[PDB]
Every structure is written in C-alpha cells, then in structure tokens.
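Researcher: I've got a protein sequence and the SMILES for mercury (II) ion. Could you write out the 3D structure of the bound complex as structure tokens? I'd like something to compare against our soaking experiments later this week.
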Amino acid sequence: VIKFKEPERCDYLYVDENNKVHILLPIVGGDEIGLDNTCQTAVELITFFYGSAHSGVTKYSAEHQLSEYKRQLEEDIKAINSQKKISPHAYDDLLKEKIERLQQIEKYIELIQVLKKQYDEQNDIRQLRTGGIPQLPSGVKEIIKSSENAFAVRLSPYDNDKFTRFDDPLFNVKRNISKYDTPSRQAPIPIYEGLGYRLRSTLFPEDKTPTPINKKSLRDKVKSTVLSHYKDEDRIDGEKKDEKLNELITNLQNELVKELVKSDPQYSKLSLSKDPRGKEINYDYLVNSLMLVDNDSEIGDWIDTILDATVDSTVWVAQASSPFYDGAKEISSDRDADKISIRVQYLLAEANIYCKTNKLSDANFGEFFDKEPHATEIAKRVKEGFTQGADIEPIIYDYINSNHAELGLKSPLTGKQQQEITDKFTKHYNTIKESPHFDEFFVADPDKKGNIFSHQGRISCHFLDFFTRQTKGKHPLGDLASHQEALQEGTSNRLHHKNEVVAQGYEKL
Amino acid sequence: VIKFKEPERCDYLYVDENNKVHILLPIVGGDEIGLDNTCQTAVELITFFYGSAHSGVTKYSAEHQLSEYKRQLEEDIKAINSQKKISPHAYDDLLKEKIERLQQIEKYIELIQVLKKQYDEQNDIRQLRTGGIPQLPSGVKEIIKSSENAFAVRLSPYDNDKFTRFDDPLFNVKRNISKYDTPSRQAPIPIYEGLGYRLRSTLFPEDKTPTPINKKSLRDKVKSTVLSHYKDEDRIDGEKKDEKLNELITNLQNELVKELVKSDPQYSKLSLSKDPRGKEINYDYLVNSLMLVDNDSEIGDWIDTILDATVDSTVWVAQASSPFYDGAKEISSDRDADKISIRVQYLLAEANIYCKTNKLSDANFGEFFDKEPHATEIAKRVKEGFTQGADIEPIIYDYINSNHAELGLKSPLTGKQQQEITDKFTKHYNTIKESPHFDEFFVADPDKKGNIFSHQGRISCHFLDFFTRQTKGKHPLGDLASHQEALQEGTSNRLHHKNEVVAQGYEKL
Ligand SMILES: [Hg+2]
Ligand SMILES: [Hg+2]
Ligand SMILES: [Hg+2]
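Model: Sure. Here is the predicted complex with mercury (II) ion in place.
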C-alpha cells in the first residue's frame, strides 16, 4: 500500500458515484435553516471567493483549496508511475479516476479565475471584499428567486434591522422603521398596524397588565381540573365516605385518561380502582393499612395518594416542550411580548414554507395576517391560549383552516400536515433561538427536488449554476457542461460530507 | 424449510455468543437512573415473580414467560425431528443449540420454583405479593450494597416520603419527619439544620422576599458584564474617542473569550479588532462607512455594533440548558425553593456518584454538606449565583475543590471531570424531573464493570447472583454454576435487547 495525499474531504467539494466533481457555492451556514442573516449573510461567499479569518484561524478560498488539491493529485499521479512497477496494470483504475478528477478540478480553477478577471465588470463579486455590508451577488439572488425548495422569510421584531439581505422573501410582514434609519440610531419608529404590532400590543399592552402563562404539567392540570369541582372544606368522611371516595376515583380517572389519550391512546384502559396487584383502592386501605390520609385530609391529599398507589411513574414523563412555553409564568415586559410575537410569526412563516414547498399555495401568508381583522384576532387568540395554558400551534392552524381559501389553499391542512409543520418549526426555531437578529431566515428543504443543496453544514447552490448566470452564458462549460443536470439526477439534495468514491480506492487496497 | 417459533426476545432473557442463557433480575425501571423510587421501588420484582397489571395490560411473570418459551422450543424441536426422514442430518447443529437452551430454561424454571417453595420461610419473596409497600428482598439489597457500579442517593425534599426503599445510599442528608410519621398525615415536622433546610431557607426566606433569577444568554451576559463598568452617560466621543473605543474593544473581547473558553478552548484566539476580511474596527468604519452608531450612541449600541461586525453567529449557539435555569424569573414560593434545593442536592449526589464509581472517594458528601458552615455557605453562594445569572454547577465544583481533602479526594476535580458530572447530572435529572417523589434515586453506570446491568430498559442484576445469595449457597447451580462469571467476561454491562444468536443459527442453514 502506497501513501496517497488526495484528501477524502475539501470544503465545497463533492464527488458523486460516477466520479463527477461538483463544487458547491455556499449561500449561508447551516443545514436546513441558515444561522447567518442580515449583516452576516455574505460571510460564506466572502470566504469562498477571498478567504477570511474566523476566531483566529485562516480560512482559505476555494481557488486556494483547489490548487492545493491539484498538487496533491499530481503527487499521487507521479507516485503511480513508480508504484506502477510493483503493479504494471493493477493500479490502472485509480489512475484513470485521479486524472479524471484532476482535469475537472483544473477546469473549475479556470472558471473561478475567469469569473473574477473577465466577468465581474459590475463588481458584484468584488464588493464582497470591499463593501461595508455586502450583498449577495446577483446570480445567487437569481438562484434563490427561482428556487423550488428554499425560501427566505422576513419577520417583524420591534427593534428591526434594516440590513436584510434576502430580497425575495416568501413570507413578509410590515415592519417598523429601523433605528438604523433614524438620526440617533437608538430606537425604531413604530407602526401601529400589522401582525407584529398586534401581537406585541395584545400580549403586553400599554397598560402594562401582564399576560399570565398558565402552563401546567399533566399531573397538575388533571389535579387542578378535578379540584375545580370540590371546595376546600370538602372531606372524605361521614356515612357516605365510601361513596364520596368512589366519585373522587371515577372523576380523577376520567380526567386523567382524557388528557392522556390526546398523546397515546393505549391509556384508554388505565384504571385507578386497583393497584397493580389488584388491591381495591378504598377508604380502609388508604387510611388503615397504608396510613396515608384520614377523614380530615384535604381532597388534594387523597388525589396524591390515589395516584401514588395506582399510576406508573412512566405516565408522568413529559412531552418535549413547544418553543412557545419556555418556563416563564407571565408575559410581563415589552421584551417578553416581542419574543412571543416573533415565535408566533416564525410559526406562520413555517406553515407558509410548508405550503410553498409542497405546492399548495404561492401566497405570502403575512399579507393576509397583517390585515385587520386577522392581525388583531390571531393575537387575541394566542393571548387567551397562554392564559389557558393551551397548545399554541393548533390555534394558528385552526385560524389558517378557517381561511384556507383566502390563503391560496385548496383544502384545510390535515392533522398530519400540521404535525409536520410543528416539527419543522420546533427544530428550526431551536437552532435559531439565540440569533442576535430575528428579521429574516433562509430555510431550505434538501429532501426535495430543487436548485439548493445541503453540504458540509452549508446551504449551497451549484457553482456552475451560479457561474452560468453571472457569466450570462457567454463562457461554455466544455467537459463540465452536463454536471449540473447530473447532480439533479441524484437521489437526494442532501450531500454526504465526505467523498466515499475517493476512499473506495484505498478500501480495495 | 421450517418456520421456527422460538422468539428472538423474552423479558429478562439474554443469550450470549456461547449459547448461555442469562436471566436478568430487574431492580427498577430505567437505563442509567431508575424511574421507580419509594413506594414504587418494588414494582419490577413484583412483576418478575408474580406478574402485575400496568395501565390496564397484564405483565406476566418470568416463570410464565419461561414456560411459554419452553413450549416454543419444544415445537421447534418436534419440527426438526419430523424433518429427519426428509433431510437426514442437515439440522444437527441447531437441534443441539435448541436443546441446550431448553435445558437451561428448564433449570431456571426449577430455581424460581425452589426459591418460592423451599427457600422463602421468612416470606422475603412472598411479601412482594402480600405486603402493602413491599421491600426489596434481602439478596437484592446485598447485591446493591456490594455494587461497584450503581448507587442509591437519598435527598431531603421538604415534604419527605418515609417509604424509601434503598437502604444503603451512597449520598445521604438529614431529613424532616415525614408527614406519614405524624398523626394527621398532613405536614412534615421540619428540622432547622442541614443542607436541605439551609437551601430552602436561603432561597426563599421567612421574609418572603423573592430571590431574582437573572439568567441571560451568553451574549447578554457578556454585554451586561462589560456594561457593569460603564455609566449611562459614557460616550465614544471627544479627543480620545479612538482610545476609548480600543478600551471598549479590549474589555469586550476579554470578557467574551473568558466566557467562551469554559466550553471550548479554540476561542482563546478570538479577536474583535478586525472583521473577518481584515477591516480595522475603528470609529470611522462604524460611524461613517457602516453608519450604525454615532458620537452620542450609548455604549450598549457600540457593543451590539462591534459584535455584529466581528463575531460568527456560530458562537452564539447555546450549550444545552442547565436544569438550574428553567425559564423562571424568580424564586418566589416555598415550592420554588424546594424544587431548586432538590436540584442542588441532586447535583452534589451526582458528583458523589462520579467520585465513587471512578474510585476517587468513598465519602458520603452529604455528611460534609449538612455540617455548618458548609450548609449555609453553599446555600448563600447558590443564591448569589442565581442573582447574578451565573452557572451553578461550577459554584458547587469550586466549593468541592476548596475542600477536596475533607471530602476524601486526593486532588481537585479537573475541568473534564466537571463536565462529565454536569452531563450525567443533566441527563439524569431530566429523566426524573416529573417524579412524584424526589427522596431517593438509584443510579447505575452500565459502562463500568460491576454486578449491575442494563437490559430492556431495566436496571438489573444477575438472577443467579440473587439466587445464590437468597438461598445462602445451600442450593448449588449445577450446569448454571459458571454463568455468572461468563456474563462478567462480556464487553459491556449494557446488554442487547434482542438475542441475535437465536436469529443467526438460521443463517448457517
Ligand atoms: Hg453588521
Ligand atoms: Hg404509594
Ligand atoms: Hg422470558
């Protein structure tokens, strides 16, 4: 075995099953949702074209990395003549494969050079290096405009940032005047209309009246609901004690299985009359054998005791939280209201993405929800929801469904579709939860057919797609001219981070 | 070709590479930390010896399940013997393998029966069926007492439950008198000393003054910390504006890397003096090219601007949330204080488990933390910590490290050891977060050598270990006498849930 230097991995570089080299132009960092937005949208392209320095580590340009990769292939190809003597025609296959990759890589190098030298009369590329807050090059914008599987969405945070860099968002709603368009640069000028305003002003009003968040654990909800029908003075005592206890057991059981069958229908058979060994839960058992309560105990203590004796502790294990419920007891500041408003808007945006990627609607949902009376209404229902501790996602889905037609939808969203949206929302929101700015996000679905791909933690397009567009078709691709279509013929737009085909020459050794 | 009926899976049943059948006696449900505690501790053993009913579904005893398995092997053995005319000897190996498993299974059946019939004259087994809140049988207690990889810990909730069932906890602290030991059964009798009391009374005092929880994101923490040395009136203006800006950049940088090197030391080289392209961050750039701030802007706006211009958005990606910060703004009830008190105690217990399983100490850390002045001191620091939004875990680790010797430790805990404890703590606490009682937990490490195993979501011991101990060595195991050592010679104490060996005797034919 001879020591090869060709790496199994370079940035932006993917090799398919047929030994075609693809270069992937990055748009932003991330997998499905971009972590970069606004001010920082250009960061990946700056690096791809010019290199940069991140947290003290030098990141090299694509061109610089293709040159390094070329040297490495050339050294590997030199070493296969010498190797050739040890195996005249037993290293044949890998040599052909390496030369094929080399020729391709050389062509990409010429394309990057000719792009920067001949075809950047606009400075569309050079402004990545020179501009203050650079823009996406126009070819990237065109690729995004035309995408069928990736879409930007733009929201309305109170303290909005003017430097959005995704110009064709699918979802969009009215925004304030950014502080950065005001002479002091300190505060926005607010608008008193639209989805953003309604949410904020409903969730924490001019009054400063907090909105309570009454989210309980399943156990507390059930216990609280049962105890609704009792008063503090109520006891399990007197002549009818056995009968009052039975009433208690039955209400508690009905309430607990009602809540549980929402999530798991197996619990339709759950029973609180008996312990797991078949012992009757009755007065004598709880008071005189176990000694846990007595005639003077409050109804809440009896509930606790009943539950401790009959319910597996696996039934109390929680669901994963909604992003809507983060542990706070109240919405008690403008900042609390902004945070929730954004979460509501982001959910509407995910629903909008879902309907656009699955070809149900072309509408911008924000156009509908910015209008009265919808803006006020959805805000009001979300607020009620928090006060009741209700699930917030369905409140949004019902409102969508009651207006499906006006949102460009043939039919209401099915329960399955709602859950798919909720899951995307939850995962994408959590990835993005700590963003310094919430004005816009780019969201890509690499499991669908389209011009955007996922690769090495970058949301990307095909370099040749970009090249053809910035170049306006004036420089034909030659040997690479079918590479774009070849990547489309692949099974998934999600691309393996390593290049297996390069290691399968070392595996055979 | 015959279809075989022997199942690939039975409860408690594991078959190793050499065709040895192992029966695993369950202690409690779970993987690393038991979900059963107190009153429910016995549930798995009740079920293993007698069966029981869970959420309306019957769970059958080991004995019943071994019998079913036996019938199935017998059918499989009939069906090979009907094929001896048709395929003279072609089934030989598998027939031996099935008879071997059958004999083993029959022996286990005999052992369970003989244990219940001849070796239970104290009713140590029978009490699981007949007692109110049963105990672990003595052999299980002996196994736990001598385990090197699993340990119970006992805590002090305010409203403590007397029915603990883990008798030899590693970590233990003073407790109140349980309400269940009082004639009314309504409230515990409190002690005014010890870790539990100090935590509760410090975190929410008799005053009823709330303790603020001022938790911030990494970004807000850093910004807040920097701004704590500036006044609202401070500006980046005047003759020394460039110099004041450099001071700001240096402080901001120092503070940000201090916070980041805790999680990842790669950020020791992070710099805020240049953007990723090498553009110097100075007054002219921020005020006149980007136009984000001016001379009158507050220092907070300059910080925002500096950070947006120099920091990758990957650095704001959060660590998993600590159980200590659950989204609340304040500790404002006895309940809130009890909840936090438990979390602090559980962390100390996890540290104690870590030091015991890795052979750093044999001490009960609770003995140390119950004593003054440590009980008061650790409470007072945890309270300061919440008020400052500091990480709580390191506060506990520093206090341990400053007293490592009195806690039986040769050296302080390393940064790595701390993070390992934090991860265990976090994952275990979240698993048990909804327990109806927090008095005790059983924690097992199946990646270490010892007498306790993980199998089919049950924390288990070897049945034969248990058998030999309950019978006091008076009934030798015969053919099974080396099965215990054989399971120890395995690679892991995490046992595969299915039995591959039973499915792979079919591949060879
Ligand atoms: Hg910026
Ligand atoms: Hg109980
Ligand atoms: Hg079994």
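Model: The CA atoms of residues 14 and 22 of chain A lie 5 Å apart. The pocket of mercury (II) ion (ligand 1) is lined by residues A 39, 133; B 308-309 (CB under 6 Å).
Researcher: Great, I'll pass this along to the crystallography team.
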